[PDB]
Enzyme design. Sequence first.
Site, mmCIF file in Angstrom:
data_model
loop_
_atom_site.group_PDB
_atom_site.id
_atom_site.type_symbol
_atom_site.label_atom_id
_atom_site.label_comp_id
_atom_site.label_asym_id
_atom_site.label_seq_id
_atom_site.Cartn_x
_atom_site.Cartn_y
_atom_site.Cartn_z
ATOM 1 C CG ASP A 1 -2.208 0.976 1.313
ATOM 2 O OD1 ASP A 1 -1.821 1.969 1.203
ATOM 3 O OD2 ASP A 1 -2.794 0.578 0.978
ATOM 4 C CB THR B 1 -3.569 6.372 -2.512
ATOM 5 O OG1 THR B 1 -3.111 5.367 -2.015
ATOM 6 C CG2 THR B 1 -4.637 6.995 -1.543
ATOM 7 C CB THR B 2 -0.427 3.867 -5.625
ATOM 8 O OG1 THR B 2 0.270 3.975 -6.712
ATOM 9 C CG2 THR B 2 -1.886 3.208 -6.481
ATOM 10 C CG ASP C 1 -13.158 2.499 -1.222
ATOM 11 O OD1 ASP C 1 -13.133 3.366 -1.220
ATOM 12 O OD2 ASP C 1 -12.486 1.443 -1.092
HETATM 13 N N1 LIG Z 1 -8.082 -7.495 -12.888
HETATM 14 C C1 LIG Z 1 -7.647 -6.306 -12.959
HETATM 15 N N2 LIG Z 1 -7.308 -6.133 -14.174
HETATM 16 C C2 LIG Z 1 -6.702 -5.433 -14.879
HETATM 17 N N3 LIG Z 1 -6.868 -3.620 -14.501
HETATM 18 C C3 LIG Z 1 -7.373 -3.731 -13.392
HETATM 19 C C4 LIG Z 1 -7.658 -5.428 -12.250
HETATM 20 N N4 LIG Z 1 -7.787 -5.138 -10.983
HETATM 21 C C5 LIG Z 1 -7.669 -3.484 -10.817
HETATM 22 N N5 LIG Z 1 -7.226 -3.186 -12.057
HETATM 23 C C6 LIG Z 1 -6.607 -1.534 -12.291
HETATM 24 O O1 LIG Z 1 -5.697 -1.141 -11.157
HETATM 25 C C7 LIG Z 1 -6.208 0.529 -10.759
HETATM 26 C C8 LIG Z 1 -6.663 0.822 -9.207
HETATM 27 O O2 LIG Z 1 -6.068 -0.363 -8.531
HETATM 28 P P1 LIG Z 1 -4.377 0.670 -8.199
HETATM 29 O O3 LIG Z 1 -3.446 1.721 -9.287
HETATM 30 O O4 LIG Z 1 -3.970 -1.123 -7.684
HETATM 31 O O5 LIG Z 1 -4.054 0.952 -6.450
HETATM 32 P P2 LIG Z 1 -5.168 2.598 -6.360
HETATM 33 O O6 LIG Z 1 -6.055 2.586 -6.522
HETATM 34 O O7 LIG Z 1 -4.839 2.772 -4.858
HETATM 35 O O8 LIG Z 1 -4.350 3.497 -7.734
HETATM 36 C C9 LIG Z 1 -7.555 0.317 -12.132
HETATM 37 O O9 LIG Z 1 -7.406 1.493 -12.148
HETATM 38 C C10 LIG Z 1 -7.983 -0.492 -12.233
HETATM 39 O O10 LIG Z 1 -7.548 -0.502 -13.924
#
Ligand SMILES: Nc1ncnc2c1ncn2[C@@H]1O[C@H](COP(=O)(O)OP(=O)(O)O)[C@@H](O)[C@H]1O
Lengths: 72, 490, 483, 477
Positions: free
Chosen positions: D45, D78-79, D344
């Site tokens: 995280d 957040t990232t 969320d």
């Molecule tokens: N199974 C998945 N396949 C492709 N993209 C995913 C999947 N799960 C989450 N994501 C991508 O991850 C992004 C957000 O998750 P992440 O970047 O890991 O953390 P945050 O939610 O803090 O940005 C989203 O834009 C989504 O498109």
Amino acid sequence: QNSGFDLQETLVKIQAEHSESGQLVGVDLNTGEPMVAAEVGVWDNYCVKKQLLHSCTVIATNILLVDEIMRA
Amino acid sequence: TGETIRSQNVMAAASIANIVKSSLGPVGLDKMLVDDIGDVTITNDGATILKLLEVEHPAAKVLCELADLQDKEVGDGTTSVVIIAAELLKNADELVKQKIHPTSVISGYRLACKEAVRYINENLIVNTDELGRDCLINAAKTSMSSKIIGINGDFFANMVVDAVLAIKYTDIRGQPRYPVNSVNILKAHGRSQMESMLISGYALNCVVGSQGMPKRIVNAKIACLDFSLQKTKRESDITKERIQKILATGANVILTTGGIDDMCLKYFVEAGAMAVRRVLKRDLKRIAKASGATILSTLANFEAAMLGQAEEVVQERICDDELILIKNTKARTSASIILRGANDFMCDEMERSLHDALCVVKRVLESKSVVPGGGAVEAALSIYLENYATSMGSREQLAIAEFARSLLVIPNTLAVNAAQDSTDLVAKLRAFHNEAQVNPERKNLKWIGLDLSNGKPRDNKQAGVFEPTIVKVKSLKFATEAAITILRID
Amino acid sequence: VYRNIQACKELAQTTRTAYGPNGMNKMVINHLEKLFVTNDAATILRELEVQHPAAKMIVMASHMQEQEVGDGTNFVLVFAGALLELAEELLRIGLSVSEVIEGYEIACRKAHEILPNLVCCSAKNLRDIDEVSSLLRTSIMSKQYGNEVFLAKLIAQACVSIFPDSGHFNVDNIRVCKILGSGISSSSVLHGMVFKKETEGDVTSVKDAKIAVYSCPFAEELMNFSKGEENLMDAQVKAIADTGANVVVTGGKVADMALHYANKYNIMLVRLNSKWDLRRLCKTVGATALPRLTPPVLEEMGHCDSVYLSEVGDTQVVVFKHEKEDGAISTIVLRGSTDNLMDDIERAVDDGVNTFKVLTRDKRLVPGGGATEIELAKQITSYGETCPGLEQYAIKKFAEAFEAIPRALAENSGVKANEVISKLYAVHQEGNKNVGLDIEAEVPAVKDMLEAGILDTYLGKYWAIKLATNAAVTVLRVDQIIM
Amino acid sequence: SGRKVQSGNINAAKTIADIIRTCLGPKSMMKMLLDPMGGIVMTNDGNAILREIQVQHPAAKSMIEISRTQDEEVGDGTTSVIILAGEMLSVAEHFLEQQMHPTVVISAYRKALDDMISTLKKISIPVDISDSDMMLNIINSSITTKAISRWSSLACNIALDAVKMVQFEENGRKEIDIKKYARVEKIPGGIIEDSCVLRGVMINKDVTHPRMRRYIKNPRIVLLDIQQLCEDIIQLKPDVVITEKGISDLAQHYLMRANITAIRRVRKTDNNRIARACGARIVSRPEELREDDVGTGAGLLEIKKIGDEYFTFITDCKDPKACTILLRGASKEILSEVERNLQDAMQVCRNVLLDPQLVPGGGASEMAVAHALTEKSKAMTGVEQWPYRAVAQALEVIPRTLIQNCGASTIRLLTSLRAKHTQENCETWGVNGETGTLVDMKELGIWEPLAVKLQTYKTAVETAVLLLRIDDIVSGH
Ligand SMILES: Nc1ncnc2c1ncn2[C@@H]1O[C@H](COP(=O)(O)OP(=O)(O)O)[C@@H](O)[C@H]1O
Ligand SMILES: Nc1ncnc2c1ncn2[C@@H]1O[C@H](COP(=O)(O)OP(=O)(O)O)[C@@H](O)[C@H]1O
Ligand SMILES: Nc1ncnc2c1ncn2[C@@H]1O[C@H](COP(=O)(O)OP(=O)(O)O)[C@@H](O)[C@H]1O
């Protein structure tokens, strides 16, 4: 690797193709795909391969058999 | 190594000015000010930058003190005065290096400052008369430019100028005065801003008070209060006796900030009083000073003739919203602008632009003597002072020449912060102002300044970029004083 | 591999500023310590001893470009530098070297066929002196100052239009003679090889003569020795007087008794023979050098047509005119205050002659001054997204490599490159191909380059593009070498 | 000095961004954080990494604070904001060294932000609220790839009630919602299935001796912060009056004489929710004592010794905005994650109430808006087109990093992904985060709320223009 493709992915694909089908499949240096290497016409010399094996084995054995390098 | 402590003071001043140089103008960049405990501050104007910058050099402390003093006079130009003083210090240091004693330099600077303040007084503008209509309009538009509402700019411009002119006071000295807080905002739901109509009086968007107000009442007296007319269990229950007494004193429209009376409907058809919750203090004070009434904390006792009066009250729906038309009071303070739309959040830039337009209008309404902005005056005096200096013949010729040359830093800095090469803008300004004197027929060219949006020379008397004369006069005087004080050091 | 790209980047940066008619001329110090100021790119490349092998390879490519087109070398260097910079960016993205190699190759192939659709060819022929005037102006104005082009171009094209016969030209026919003195105004066009001599006992009316060529320049017992030396020199001058010779050349100085002897047999003692003249004279007269004064014979002699002294240009100069071809060689007299500003005019004239020769080879013209480069860049970058695959990145970088030329040409004139390139690109989609970058205006403004008449040859840019792309590819194909 | 300070600002931004640029997606890598004693901790995280890391640059601190304030406001993402801001500031380098003023770059960034907002509004697929099946699909899209995958079934209905029980009629019709007014009740112990939701404010405290008229069919709570006041309370004769002071036995006798029930040692986090749910008022000044003292409140009270401990039940409140949500289980290690993921979900529902829409996931939205911006840059002219194209070319980091921390090569997959957006009109394909291959996201089933995407893009652009606007850091060092 020299064509920019993934080193292990191409080898895995080639090995899988040669395992499932007995055709001597090779690497295609424009798409990174297993290619039959017979219809494409990429033939290599037989004597070159034979001499390659003979040379590589003897050189590797000779280098592996050395020890105690000495300053003559 | 090191020598000539005068040069050290000049370099300290130059560094201090360069800290704030890039923020000059409305389009200046920001500075992030870090304290010892790590907090940060973001600001555009350099006045607070000087008030917050940790100065350590004794020479720079004098500039900081003079800039702070300039802030206490009119509150503008601190960046400009610091930059002008620094340029004067650099030029005077060079003159000293070329074997001119600082005494003659100081005398030349004093004469140049006096000549500049005399020249400006005979080339300013006092056309902010009743006949000045388009100038205020496009001044408001320039303060409101670079926005999507430019398609219908003229209507909002004439609305705001009519609102600001119709509400002016007349003080003891007779000089018209304007409170910015007099006019307030009023949101609306539905159609967009193009149908907004100026409200002649303060209007509150809340629950409907009563229908007892006629089309126009002959007398509407503002008996404002601050308590909630609520039944409880000169009266223990403040519902009937106090309102009866105040009506006997002659209270027509009794204002109640708090809750409405339970039985107000019967009393509001025979007296016509007001009952709407949440009356803003900012607007309550303004309407009280408009009609002339005062807020009464208590009524158990002055109340007949002291209370204010309103000419007429109108009950109507504006943009599907009921508003109270307490208008045409004794003194003109009661006015509001309806913001047709859906919410104040989507029109935040619109209301902010209206507020800044009102501010730039009230800047030029007061101090009727006004000068063009955008570096026009600096270029004009730079042209003046070279020709003035060449006719002296004393040892102060070079001092006045360098004063004139350094006076151009303000338009140059404005051009630099405007993302245009300052060389071309300054040269064009000087070229336009040259024929403003060598050619008498092209006299209507002195009011040529630089436009920050397009980066090209443009008339500002017609455009409306304006400044009070007192601001620039005091800035020049204080820059000269600071420069003289630094040059006296050795 | 990035070290080669870096070396090429500094190589291009060194001579980039000399591009265009506003070249920032440099100061050149040759090995013999001559204070020499010039703006030519080839000259500074010659004096610079490029040490890095990649810079050497680009320099060889430029030499090949000059060897068969005669001009455009600075364009080659700037273009190759831009190509290598953008290739470095592509490599840092993650592309393999091979991918950008075929991308550049396909982009060059597409550009070579896009180019011939941008032609505003020559009017009628090599003749019509006043027309090849306007044709020859651009190269001269580019190389040397834009002020003197109106005269330099006329002088350089009047001399070359003399013999537009059979469609065959030779640059060595157009020679240049250096005459110190007044300004360039007195410079004009002459015919035949020209230099200055010493003696005055010369006859003007000369038919096919016999020309000498020299490869090596010059109590009683004392009187006897003097008499013997006098008789020996009598024998030498009688030997040279054999076979009815009338002229003699020598790389040394004059001698009073020798000039007396020459006058006795009516021989013009031609002197002040330069080390640059001995074999060009033999080539232009079909003669051979003689070691000493003893071996002249009838066979080992030259033959001219007319030898006389012309005082035009306020200087005495000998001229050998109407040679075996009778109109082949045609010199140009140059007049300047000092030599360092005369060689600039010489090399400008050479570039003009080369451009005229290229026009002889083909009559196609292309709008220069940043017009054709920006049009090619627009066409290629439009073709880029029509080609899916990994080659699109290389194609777009190639389009930018074209874009880099007018940017440098603008920077050389003190104008913001980004603003002018954006304005040019925007106006070039409607105000099409014939528009370019105006130089005189200090504002970043554009101007059509057909009415302005600034045009450059088509084969020049074709070969320059081909050679520059080949150089960039062939320097991208190396990886390392320990050094 | 001059532009070098801005270059340093954006370099610090770039490095603090690419510390955690790999820690996103369903295949996030694990950073190691070591304290100056030898301990080691591994985390997926980015908020934690940014928290325990120490930065000496004020711009880095500003970006960290931006990520923080973005975390509480919207939850996840957040990232993504950090990565986007870092890439935009990194791509500003090329123009800053080309001697162009930061003002034109900022202006181009602002037009780009406007165009991206328009594109996101255009490409979003409509979604209708209260449909449980696609609600579950959204839960699987967002709340999954966490520690709740086997416990998401209860979180689904918990969020389904939570979105309906904090409704606010402030500016319009139900579109206003808040997160800190729902009366969360986290009590460990027992099986997790005991958790449920109740309508009405939930209070952990109760009278010491509940031997009195405590529950009445119409609780009209009166807030207070004295015997004379005890008789003055009878001015309207309420049934319950809530204070914040202890109550004694003689005080209790006074209370049943006054027919009121006081409370003690109640946290303000409970009192404010009580007042919001029941619409209570506080008044003690005799002059202020009027008809507006006692407001209508709840309609039922209950006494329950749940878990052999003293509690208070307040149901049928006047305002169903602060109702009872009960959490049960073994420990708090997951229920906090349940809380944030239901937050969320509440944001999903609130934005659907504002804009009933969703956008494709897995970098599909990023590539779509990048294509829209690049094709829109062709028509518009000016010197500022270069930053306008650069922001579009730099926003593609999300698919790039998704491919990167998956095994697959980024360059070829990204090139193919672009190729699937330019010659095709209504596709909006994306990259699968698990297999690292191109897949139509409307088939895979990954979507994000419009609220979070709009907030991320807006915050990234604002942070970029802020860090480009900062000209000097001169108040010291
Ligand atoms: N199974 C998945 N396949 C492709 N993209 C995913 C999947 N799960 C989450 N994501 C991508 O991850 C992004 C957000 O998750 P992440 O970047 O890991 O953390 P945050 O939610 O803090 O940005 C989203 O834009 C989504 O498109
Ligand atoms: N609308 C405008 N157009 C052109 N110039 C302006 C405008 N508004 C302010 N300026 C310029 O900004 C300069 C300083 O203004 P400001 O920064 O507000 O005062 P201070 O420097 O005291 O904070 C003035 O010299 C003025 O010419
Ligand atoms: N007036 C002009 N405006 C713009 N470009 C010009 C002008 N005159 C010449 N040029 C350019 O100069 C270039 C060639 O000159 P230069 O690079 O100096 O030497 P070379 O001929 O060896 O390349 C041509 O590309 C031509 O477009």
